[PDB]
Amino acid sequence: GGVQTVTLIPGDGIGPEISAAVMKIFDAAKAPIQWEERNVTAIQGPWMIPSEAKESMDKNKMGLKGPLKTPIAAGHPSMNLLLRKTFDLYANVRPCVSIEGYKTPYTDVNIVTIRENTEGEYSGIEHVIVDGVVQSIKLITEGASKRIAEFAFEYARNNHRSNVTAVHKANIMRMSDGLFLQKCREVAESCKDIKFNEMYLDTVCLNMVQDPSQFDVLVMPNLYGDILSDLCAGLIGGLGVTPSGNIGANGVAIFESVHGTAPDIAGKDMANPTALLLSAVMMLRHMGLFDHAARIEAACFATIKDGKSLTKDLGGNAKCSDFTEEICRRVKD
Amino acid sequence: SFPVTMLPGDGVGPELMHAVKEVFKAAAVPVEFQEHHLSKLEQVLSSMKENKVAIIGKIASYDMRLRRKLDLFANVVHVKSLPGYMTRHNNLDLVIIREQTEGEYSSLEHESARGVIECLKIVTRAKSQRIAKFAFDYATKKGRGKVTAVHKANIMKLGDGLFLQCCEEVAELYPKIKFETMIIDNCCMQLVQNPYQFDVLVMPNLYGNIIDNLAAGLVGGAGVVPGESYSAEYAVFETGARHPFAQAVGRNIANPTAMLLSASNMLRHLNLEYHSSMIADAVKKVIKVGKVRTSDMGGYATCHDFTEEICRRVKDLDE
């Protein structure tokens, strides 16, 4: 009931191709979405992202972001760092599910890694104490830890998920990770409809590679999230087929592809939009267009099990457009 | 001859050490174990001063103190598939070299305001240049061809960049070994997708924790991956993935494979090549024939049953 505007950041490289392919798949299923292309490439006035990009994301809360090219300048900061602080992106969510057409040594994987995005070892605080002695400061606070453990039990109930696991190393970093655990438990007792437990980062790592089936929703501090999420990516096929969203403050969210900009195949009709598509599916669900999302999702999955059209990186000769149009065909059920 | 210090340790440690001496007495091994049932107890440093090698179970914290009282700065974990035991990744062969005395492991934590905890992570050029020369000496001593340095220098520009910088500097002195760098989270994902691109890996403490257990689970898990920790005078042998709930559950259920395997490494270090090759090959052959397998490997055998079979094969003469 009403047509919405998503800020679309096409990005670099195969960026615009996959963006414009997702726009076409949304069109096909007549999904209530206008797009508003913006550019997040940073400038610095009196460091920041363009004003038009901020006013856009602030007005319409949703974004869809393709792969950005890694800047060249030493002094140029990380683009995700500028994105995070601008909109207070505090929860990075990664649902990792095996794709049925794409065979991997792991077959039964269905995991969601909620990752605290604001602090941890990414505090940005380092000091050179003396010559050849550096000191990086890991920061854990009670506010932020609580915020993330609340999101994770929400996500777990909203997306009808049954277990949440707090992953820490509180045996080593007794005070920092201890506080994180302390608040996770605090939230877990006020949401007793979800079986909550704890594990050690190294116990989860050793178990993930042997049997991912036992895991569900996982919530963890920043560094642990960064490692674990890419680790689980490899369980299902890699950054090319994994969605990603960063929930932030003021209803803002940006859903993103985490895969590379891939310039060697820019222009040529060979990119894969599966990753950017499944992220925009997340966006739809986060917006409450649940049937448009379950539909689009069903099509893309059906296309990949057929095998008829796969791009170069899933074992096909099919072009980016032959893949896209098969989905669009499929989504008019 | 040959005195060796033995710390049986927390958890099933006592039961693995019982298996070790049982196979040792089986293979008639010239090694007498001088053991301390720990947990100052700096009696340990005295015995290592005379003995110079140890076999240890699972034990700033004691572990990171004892390491520091022994200057066990380098940790080596051998990730190598065993032929009989099948996994999603077979025929794998990696070396994980890990710094042990720095990073987040020294309890440098404090409260700057109510509910704001700071925790310090220390990287120094001293300890990094050292672990970096040790990794390249390991690559040359052993015939390995590549040393990949794992870091997150894009976020921790100083510090993880200091560690990186020492690796590149050390790497010029060894022009016969190839040197690559990779980012920890990228490395973890490549380790599940394709771990065969790696030869030797070198990383600071916390990343080494992660990649020790992650690789360990590639080739069979906490019961079969062995590991050493070296000083410049000392050699301590343990298990490779030594995480908190590693083998602590169960009684007469644990896998002695990793402990035996590094015990045979200890024998190789002691220059007892004959007994090292025997015990190792016995263990490896009980696993290949697949007669007896412990629960973590998919079988029904007790720890005693597995060890019994290792002895039956060290003693066999028709081999």
Order of helices and strands of chain B: EHEHEHEEEEHEHEHEHEEHHH
Total of helices of chain A: 10
What is the rounded distance between the termini of chain A? 21 Å
Show the largest interface: A-B, 50 and 56 residues
Secondary structure tally: strands of chain B: 12
Tell me the fraction of residues in β-strands of chain B, as a range.
15-25%
Share of helical residues of chain B: 40-55%
Mind telling me the CATH class of chain B? Alpha Beta
Order of helices and strands of chain A: EHEHEHEEEEHEHEHEHEEHHH
Assigned CATH class of chain A: Alpha Beta
Number of strands of chain A: 12
Oligomer: heterodimer
Question: Can you describe this structure in just a few lines?
Answer:
Chain B: It is found in: Mitochondrion. The complex is a heterodimer of chains A (333) and B (319). Chain A contains ten helices and twelve strands.
Outline the structure in words.
The complex is a heterodimer of chains A (333) and B (319). With 333 residues, chain A is an alpha/beta fold. Helix content of chain A is 39%, strand content 23%. Chain A has a single domain (1-333), classed as Isopropylmalate Dehydrogenase (3-Layer(aba) Sandwich). Chain A is built from ten helices and twelve strands. With 319 residues, chain B is of the alpha/beta class. Chain B has one domain (1-319): Isopropylmalate Dehydrogenase. Helices cover 41% and strands 21% of the residues of chain B. Chain B is built from ten helices and twelve strands. In chain B, the strands form two sheets. In chain B, strands 2-1-3-12-11-4-5-10-8-9 form a ten-stranded mixed β-sheet, sandwiched between helices. In chain B, strands 6-7 form a two-stranded antiparallel ribbon. In chain B, a hairpin with a 2-residue loop joins strand 6 and strand 7 (116-124). In chain B, helix 1 (13-26) packs parallel to helix 10 and helix 9 (273-289) crosses helix 10 (303-315). Chain B is globular, with a radius of gyration of 20 Å. At the A-B interface, strand 6, strand 7, helix 6 and helix 7 of A face strand 6, strand 7, helix 6 and helix 7 of B.
